[PDB]
Symmetry: D2
Subunit: 198 residues, 4 copies
Amino acid sequence: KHSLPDLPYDYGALEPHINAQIMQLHHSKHHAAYVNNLNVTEEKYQEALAKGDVTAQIALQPALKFNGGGHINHSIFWTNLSPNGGGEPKGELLEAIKRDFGSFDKFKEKLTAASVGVQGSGWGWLGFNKERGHLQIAACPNQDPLQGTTGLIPLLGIDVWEHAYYLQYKNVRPDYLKAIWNVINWENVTERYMACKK
Amino acid sequence: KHSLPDLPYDYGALEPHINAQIMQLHHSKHHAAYVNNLNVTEEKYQEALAKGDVTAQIALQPALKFNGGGHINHSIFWTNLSPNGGGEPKGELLEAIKRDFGSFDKFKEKLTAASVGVQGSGWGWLGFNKERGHLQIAACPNQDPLQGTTGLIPLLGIDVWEHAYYLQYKNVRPDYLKAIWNVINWENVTERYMACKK
Amino acid sequence: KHSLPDLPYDYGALEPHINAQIMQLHHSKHHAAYVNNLNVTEEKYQEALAKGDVTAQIALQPALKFNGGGHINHSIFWTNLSPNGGGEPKGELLEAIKRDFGSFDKFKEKLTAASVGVQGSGWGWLGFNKERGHLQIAACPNQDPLQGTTGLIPLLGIDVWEHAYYLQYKNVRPDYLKAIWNVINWENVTERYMACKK
Amino acid sequence: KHSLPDLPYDYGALEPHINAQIMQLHHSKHHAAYVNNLNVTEEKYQEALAKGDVTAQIALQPALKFNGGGHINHSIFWTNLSPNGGGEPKGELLEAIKRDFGSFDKFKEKLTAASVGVQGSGWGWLGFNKERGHLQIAACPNQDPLQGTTGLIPLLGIDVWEHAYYLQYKNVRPDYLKAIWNVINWENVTERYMACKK
Ligand SMILES: [Mn+2]
Ligand SMILES: [Mn+2]
Ligand SMILES: [Mn+2]
Ligand SMILES: [Mn+2]
């Protein structure tokens, strides 16, 4: 059984880019629902697997994918954001961005374009293609995890679900992205790239 | 080139079930963006078709589907809601609900379950299966139109996109559905069933 | 661990509608591969679930769905076909077809149209919608099981995968369907409807 | 209105890797059906677009995608195969394979794995990611074109549809791939890379 990961920072840490209400509602309601439904799906699905009902497993596949992907995506998202984060990434990760996207601003605009291009709910991901050994930009609809679906190891995540920004930015998602670029925890992305690149 | 259909009722007509801010933002921003992107996609796609580029047409298919389905779905949605609407449908449509779902409350709970079951963005639809000649409950993700995709002629539509209810009901979609059941324009659904059943 | 179900009839029973080579290759190779890959996916996926890796489970979901659906679909398919089968279904199932499709020939042409309409690999299904309590015609791509995906309890199945008919009928699938209508085991479909309707 | 492209080589040119029957049936039946259905879909869809029926366009989208993608994919496939082709690619394309996949044999095994991994019908593609400027391996189900869907400009294509190999290799697709590696027209792939890389 999974558990809800506590935020490393208080709800009002992301002022004013993300107001306290959005963080509070997001974490305490949407991620909590994801983890609770994940636990329910896990217990039902495990008893189905023990019974040996393939039809039941295939029926439960969408719910398990949705809840587990939501949990994983939001767990990555919370770590990816810091009150102290933002600005310009440093170290080998910056060089990787330079050699894969030409410049950091080009990476910013490409990730912003990918995030806005998500029709409906979804996620915009910066991930390390380990087999090819280079950074990539992806967009995954709904709560589809990056590593589970595409195989790319996730480094940076942007939640373009409407619950992430509607209470503050209404329909202008580009403003939400421009703001969230100020709270990215580039140190955590550096740790993820170090652990992934290795 | 398509145009944005004006609301038959003012923005504050749906008080208090749907506050004025949600109706105003929805109609003036989301549907306007859908119709504008639909016009852009139509002109680009028509010049591509005249040129005879199948690859360009297949590339433009997702954008055309998204924008056109959004326009159609919201155009149906605005007519489906009335300040005077709500309560209990009358006439042959009520008998059709009785003979297809057992009772009107059973239809209400089935449509509510279908609408809540939409993972992410989507739409919950009551539609007349014309070939089989009976009412059906469907759920279509994102802005997929009912008639275009499933072939069911749409009668009643519920927008479970987060922009439809987040500013008022936050994460509890069931409360949004319970409220929207008070503003359903059953007379327009009766007209749609008469024109469809015929 | 699952096992390959033996055919109730020998390979050459379906002469001349389905030649012995197609039945032999189908059962001994395609279904055997499905069940073997299903066993492998089950063991890998069960150890992943015991470990508690949601990402691994979501990664293994497509393979499990493909193999398990192939196994279930072919297990239903083998029972649905009999050397003695064919002709005109008798009993309450015939009345159900009459009241849901108008006539048996209308059901035949509707199921044939659904089977031919499958773009690529897939399956054409006659299934009892238990909640609505009436027969329905569905088409499921690749090896997607009917009950697992759509919830319809499967009664009759038609494999429109190219391995089912290419060695004999080449590209004309309609001839394959017209032939397979002579070997349908309507008694087994009657048993399935009795067990389902109940 | 599109037309069926004639084969640059006679039907029996690919002996013994691809027998004359497979080439004859493939080109004269499957691709002919694709182009005919593409013409029908184009005329219906163009009159729908002129009428201004978005629902009709969205309904016709799947058929247009299927037929047009089939036509494009098979038109690329016929050029990609030559009686004189096979062996080891020469020139800058070989260096591109070396720098993107490590060695030519690694590219061969990766493309073979991608082609076999296609569950059901599909296509395995070697394509130049123009934005990132490097070669990539992709798999597209059914008749989905590479450039239309993923944006990768197609260079080499492998038809893993069962009509491509079932009459000769039955269920062992790996043998079909090992054989088709002897008839790849690397000169045409070099031309495609030159025109794409530019
Ligand atoms: Mn979220
Ligand atoms: Mn809406
Ligand atoms: Mn089969
Ligand atoms: Mn082909």
